[PDB]
């Protein structure tokens, strides 16, 4: 079956798009065209960011689609069928949802991996780079699989660190150790 | 003017959903007619469900409904015929002349959905009907314009009691009567038809001081619901 | 651009927090898109003149309960917010 089975909430639509356009081989193209229309949707503020949510007709929904495909003369044709589907199912709220999901599948085709290095505060770039190197060096990142690593600020955790990527994490935090210390001195 | 075209979407028993043309929804409590090989199936609009897809209740059998079957819109609440020539006719739910003495000679038609009278209009009487039945007369006298209620169990000759009332008060009184049967058995129906033909309250040439709405239990539950409404309008 | 303009054209551009439109009406339970300024059980007046209370405030829709008769209400109906919670003359 096609790489990465997500099957989200209306992510079966994304899956469908992925596999259908994967056999067209125009997934990068599709993704790019989808991104371009998604961006111009995001930069369309009245409607589709203020009537992102529906209340429109079938016919009016269709006419909203016609304006959307009026803006782009490069819009593939599988995502023009996807637009049709979304119009017909009268979902537009799962427009960005599908975009994100198709993106995950797409970047799975690309083989880009994602990670996160939550910390209390944002840290040094030297640390970021050393960790990125380390993670790529480690078997955790496979070869032919790229690494995207995002440091995030998670002041919710005070002190400590957690490295996260490929749903496998190493958590060397202060909080857990403090917890354990406390617990053991409540023994 | 132009009947709103509807396409059936789901036949789920009596509930039949229709997909009327965009930007025009036949209002709740309207009457839709679908020409069918067996008459016109009447669907009473009972909900709007969105994007010109309504959910309606059938008033006739739902056999042989083909998905996406063109649905004309009458445009308003099921309108029966009313008149003084409705007296001595058996009139079904959608107002058909099942009298079988041929077409009812319509004067006016009226909707079967109508808002009940206001507090101001209602004037409370206090006059005594009497049936000559000893128990009734002594222990529970009936009153003109009343709302008498024959609570009882299964087959306590419920119909028989009513027949006795018809024999006494109806024949005697000069007013009209309306005999409405909701889910009455066709055995009971034939007897009633015959009995009031015999008593001449339905006089086959003469004037009739009663009208009939015989609702048969074989008719769909939805149709059974609006047997009552039909009778009320008469 | 021209698309965005035409999009503005086909959009109601309703204030839509005063100002509701029925999404669906069944069983005397109008479910309205709009009325973001609503306060619960507050009196709202439809354009059929029907009055209602808003017993359910839900994120997607506001479930007006009709005080009128359902036969006079139909979808997409403007629902102005009377904006005074049920009050009755006293004196």
UniProtKB/Swiss-Prot annotation, chain A:
Pfam families: OSCP. It is found in: Mitochondrion; Mitochondrion inner membrane. GO terms for cellular component: mitochondrial inner membrane; mitochondrion; proton-transporting ATP synthase complex. GO terms for molecular function: proton-transporting ATP synthase activity, rotational mechanism. GO terms for biological process: proton motive force-driven ATP synthesis; proton motive force-driven mitochondrial ATP synthesis. InterPro entries: ATP_synth_OSCP/delta_N_sf, ATPase_OSCP/d_CS, ATPase_OSCP/dsu. Keywords: ATP synthesis, Hydrogen ion transport, Ion transport, Membrane, Mitochondrion, Mitochondrion inner membrane, Transit peptide, Transport. Gene3D superfamilies: N-terminal domain of the delta subunit of the F1F0-ATP synthase. Its main location: mitochondrion. PANTHER family: ATP SYNTHASE DELTA CHAIN. Present with 32400 molecules/cell in log phase SD medium. Belongs to the ATPase delta chain family. Mitochondrial membrane ATP synthase (F(1)F(0) ATP synthase or Complex V) produces ATP from ADP in the presence of a proton gradient across the membrane which is generated by electron transport complexes of the respiratory chain. F-type ATPases consist of two structural domains, F(1) - containing the extramembraneous catalytic core and F(0) - containing the membrane proton channel, linked together by a central stalk and a peripheral stalk. During catalysis, ATP synthesis in the catalytic domain of F(1) is coupled via a rotary mechanism of the central stalk subunits to proton translocation. F-type ATPases have 2 components, CF(1) - the catalytic core - and CF(0) - the membrane proton channel. CF(1) has five subunits: alpha(3), beta(3), gamma(1), delta(1), epsilon(1). CF(0) has three main subunits: a, b and c. This is ATP synthase subunit 5, mitochondrial. The lineage of its organism: Eukaryota, Fungi, Dikarya, Ascomycota, Saccharomycotina. The gene is ATP5.
UniProtKB/Swiss-Prot annotation, chain B:
ATP binds at residues 152-159. The modification Phosphothreonine is found at residues 74, 199. It is found in: Mitochondrion; Mitochondrion inner membrane. It comes from the Eukaryota. Belongs to the ATPase alpha/beta chains family. Mitochondrial membrane ATP synthase (F(1)F(0) ATP synthase or Complex V) produces ATP from ADP in the presence of a proton gradient across the membrane which is generated by electron transport complexes of the respiratory chain. F-type ATPases consist of two structural domains, F(1) - containing the extramembraneous catalytic core, and F(0) - containing the membrane proton channel, linked together by a central stalk and a peripheral stalk. During catalysis, ATP synthesis in the catalytic domain of F(1) is coupled via a rotary mechanism of the central stalk subunits to proton translocation. F-type ATPases have 2 components, CF(1) - the catalytic core - and CF(0) - the membrane proton channel. CF(1) has five subunits: alpha(3), beta(3), gamma(1), delta(1), epsilon(1). CF(0) has three main subunits: a, b and c. Present with 164000 molecules/cell in log phase SD medium. This is ATP synthase subunit beta, mitochondrial. It comes from Saccharomyces cerevisiae (strain ATCC 204508 / S288c).
Swiss-Prot record, chain C:
Present with 41500 molecules/cell in log phase SD medium. The modification Phosphoserine is found at residue 11. This is ATP synthase subunit alpha, mitochondrial. Belongs to the ATPase alpha/beta chains family. Transmembrane segments: none annotated. F-type ATPases have 2 components, CF(1) - the catalytic core - and CF(0) - the membrane proton channel. CF(1) has five subunits: alpha(3), beta(3), gamma(1), delta(1), epsilon(1). CF(0) has three main subunits: a, b and c. The chain holds residues 47 to 137 of 545 of the full protein. It is found in: Mitochondrion inner membrane. Mitochondrial membrane ATP synthase (F(1)F(0) ATP synthase or Complex V) produces ATP from ADP in the presence of a proton gradient across the membrane which is generated by electron transport complexes of the respiratory chain. F-type ATPases consist of two structural domains, F(1) - containing the extramembraneous catalytic core, and F(0) - containing the membrane proton channel, linked together by a central stalk and a peripheral stalk. During catalysis, ATP synthesis in the catalytic domain of F(1) is coupled via a rotary mechanism of the central stalk subunits to proton translocation.
